[PDB]
RNA sequence: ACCCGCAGAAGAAGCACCGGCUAACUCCGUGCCAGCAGCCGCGGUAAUACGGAGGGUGCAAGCGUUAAUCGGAAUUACUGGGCGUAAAGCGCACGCAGGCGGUUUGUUAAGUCAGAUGUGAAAUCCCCGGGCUCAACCUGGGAACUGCAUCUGAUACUGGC
RNA sequence: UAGCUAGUAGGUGGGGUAACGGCUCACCUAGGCGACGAUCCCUAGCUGGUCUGAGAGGAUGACCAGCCACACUGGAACUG
């Protein structure tokens, strides 16, 4: 590549795209939620998998991860919806958060206390 | 026209008492055309906790400039 | 104070035939702990035969290096199979710091205040024949000036 | 990082005396001294050749009890200070005002030798202080307040340095509660059961 | 021509350390003969001369000392083309110092040591080291 | 002392007034650009002698209309 | 502010984590079910990876989790550029505009440079002092910025002829 | 996005202005811009300074100063 082919335009530089776009770079969104299915995982593995159909506040509308276990998610609820890979899902990239809005806390939890939704009664 | 003040100079209640040749449009912290010295009485307990240059008051002070009630009793103490 | 240092383990397995077999190699360094750098290859069926092996290389391997005074000079680059190992005299702080496979080997030919970045393969048997060439490529100011008559 | 737990059972854990919950009643006897920690353990892990120098050095901070960034202040001072960074930074930390606090006799452990600084029982200089980062000047005078000359805290401390090895570099009183800091430790004036001519190697990065 | 002299001496040398030559043959310019002075000069070859009028032929005798090879690296600055000028002060160092740098400055072709030390500044031509 | 500039014409056809294109050279060290580049400018001219080809010396004088302040000193050089 | 008293241990500790990388792990339940992950993969009757118990590791008024931009990546290359087949050489070519060429002298002194004179204020990096406990911050004294503009010279060289 | 321009280019002389100019008028001329990116669209206040890294190189113009532009949202003026 000689000086005149290096003319009027900077070397290009490019991709850091995001894989998460409805989010539209917020960390957390909100949206409505309207229905909750069971699907298969990937590998052979017979586990099960829950994911939630959710309509965001912005208009697009994404298929969303349920972790841990036990949920009270139903049509028009409204819940928070964050980015994180699943790599037992095809294409699913969304995920619910439990400490917001009306979703619910998981059952029977002795690890981790910031985390699934929980908080430990106070006086 | 020229005058010379007297200003805090310095954060929140960390002062340095300096002083300054400036002109009468100036605003209370705005410009200034000279830094000549300060006149601070704790001075962080040191010795030569007051000073002012000899050589930059004669410029200004012989001369019109106009001197502060907060300042006159050190120029009269070097006598300039 | 001589001391006999490991760099890296390898493993390679292979099926046969029916089954499989896995052999082991290590990379070591002895020298003299200043001015002179030796390594040894060594591969076995066990990892401390293959470290075994290797210091039976190492003590039978030597490099002169044009040194004074535990140091540097002057940048240096060598270069070995896609590794481009290149050396920067390090000063005012830690001197080791560098590439995780240089440690050992610049402190048994007593050099170890060097900041070192391999620049392409990190493959540990490149690497040390990289950084070993750039040592064989380092000289002496002195020599550099004294290429003139008289 | 707080430990919230027993004295002896963090000093069972590093294996070694700490000077924690020190007092005339003595350690041996009915306390697990020198025992093995948990279920399983040497008295001595076999350690990696850089492991074995990094165990030495958290027993070196702990010993004197000092936080990461204070340990490396002292060897980033004792690296540019004569010949062995080891014996320089023993050097340093031997000097510091909690330690000079304690070897004086004001209390009866090293964390309670620096909780009388926090505390602002100290004097140096006739001056009051507050902050365990200093390092104390060669025949300066180490005081306490009027005001807590009467803490059994320092009654105590006192009966316990009547009951050890003298050093050998200072002089003190208990009727004045004040002592003068002559010079540093020479050569056989210290020892310890932990080593530091050797951990002059780390670092990393 | 040959479209640039120049080329035709740096690649002539440089191509001759790596066939371990004695000594190498070129046609003759006042560049070359200069270049060739600074060389014996810093020890990088150990004689030159030319021979001829019609056809006048330079012969340089090469020079690699105690160890292995003389130089790392030898490389183009200024050219016929894009010449790039520095004043006494704003002269670069190659190689922490014991590398060089060639400057035609005002008097001659010589080192930037020379130059910052007679006071010069010029075209800078190449890199030594 | 002046700055003179240098180019050679390429239109006439004004009452009282030329059109110069004028040569320059740009390194911009910032990117490492080095070229040369061409501009065009109006210049007065009431003697009307200049053919167009004709190179051209200009100084900075008096503002007519946009880009026209420079006017003509001499002709430099005749086409052919 | 700063100093001296008075109550009474009183008013004051969490969060992530424990196969291996990368520090801590044993026993028992579940028995491919159900969960867990940064990547390996774990999980069918001794599960180092799930759940629980008893202990243990890292950090601490915090501890985990995320977002955007730049690094690690020479992987947009000046320093580190590339192009048979991997990836990048116009089907075979002519040629206008752009880029661009040996050697010598005379001449000009635009650029080029040596001496001379301006600028790039204040703050501040860095360097020699002072103030607070470090990091901040404040304060006394410094240093430099290829150039651009002007003037006295030289024309080795580049442009011009 | 490769074509675009009648107050668009040039002469002469008033009237207004500190003052230049289709600012605006009278009587003429037929020119101008274009791959060194014209015409058109999107983003953005500028500078001292600020930020990042092996530097090189990019990015940045919250902060404290020196300027611009602007003040319901649009168009004009006076007074000093």
Known sequence: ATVNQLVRKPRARKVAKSNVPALEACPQKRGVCTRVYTTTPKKPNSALRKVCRVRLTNGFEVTSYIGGEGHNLQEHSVILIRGGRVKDLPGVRYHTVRGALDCSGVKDRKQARSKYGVKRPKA | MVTIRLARHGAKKRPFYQVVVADSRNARNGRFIERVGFFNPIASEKEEGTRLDLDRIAHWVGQGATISDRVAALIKEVNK | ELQEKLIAVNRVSKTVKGGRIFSFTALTVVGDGNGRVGFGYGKAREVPAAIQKAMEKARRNMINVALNNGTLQHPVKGVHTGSRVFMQPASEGTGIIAGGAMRAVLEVAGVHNVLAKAYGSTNPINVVRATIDGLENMNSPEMVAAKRGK | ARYLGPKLKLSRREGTDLFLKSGVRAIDTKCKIEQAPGQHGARKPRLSDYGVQLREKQKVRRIYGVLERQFRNYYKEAARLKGNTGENLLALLEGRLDNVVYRMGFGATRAEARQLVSHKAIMVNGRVVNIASYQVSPNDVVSIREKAKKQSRVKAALELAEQREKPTWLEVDAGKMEGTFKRKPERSDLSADINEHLIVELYSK | ?129 | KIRTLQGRVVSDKMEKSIVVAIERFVKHPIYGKFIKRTTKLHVHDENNECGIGDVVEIRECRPLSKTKSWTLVRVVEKAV
């Open chain 5, 1 to 129: 021509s040959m479209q640039d002299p120049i080329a035709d001496m740096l690649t002539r040398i440089r191509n001759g350390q790596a066939a371990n030559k004695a000594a190498v043959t070129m046609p003759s310019s006042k560049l070359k003969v200069a270049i060739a002075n600074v060389l014996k000069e810093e020890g990088f070859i150990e004689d030159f001369k030319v021979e001829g009028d019609t056809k006048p032929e330079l012969e340089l005798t090469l020079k690699y000392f105690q160890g292995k090879a003389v130089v790392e690296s030898i490389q183009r600055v200024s050219r016929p083309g894009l010449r790039i000028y520095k004043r006494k002060d704003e002269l670069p160092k190659v190689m922490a110092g014991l590398g060089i740098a060639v400057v035609s400055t005002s008097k001659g072709v010589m080192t930037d040591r020379a130059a910052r030390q007679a006071g010069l500044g010029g075209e800078i031509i190449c890199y030594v080291a």
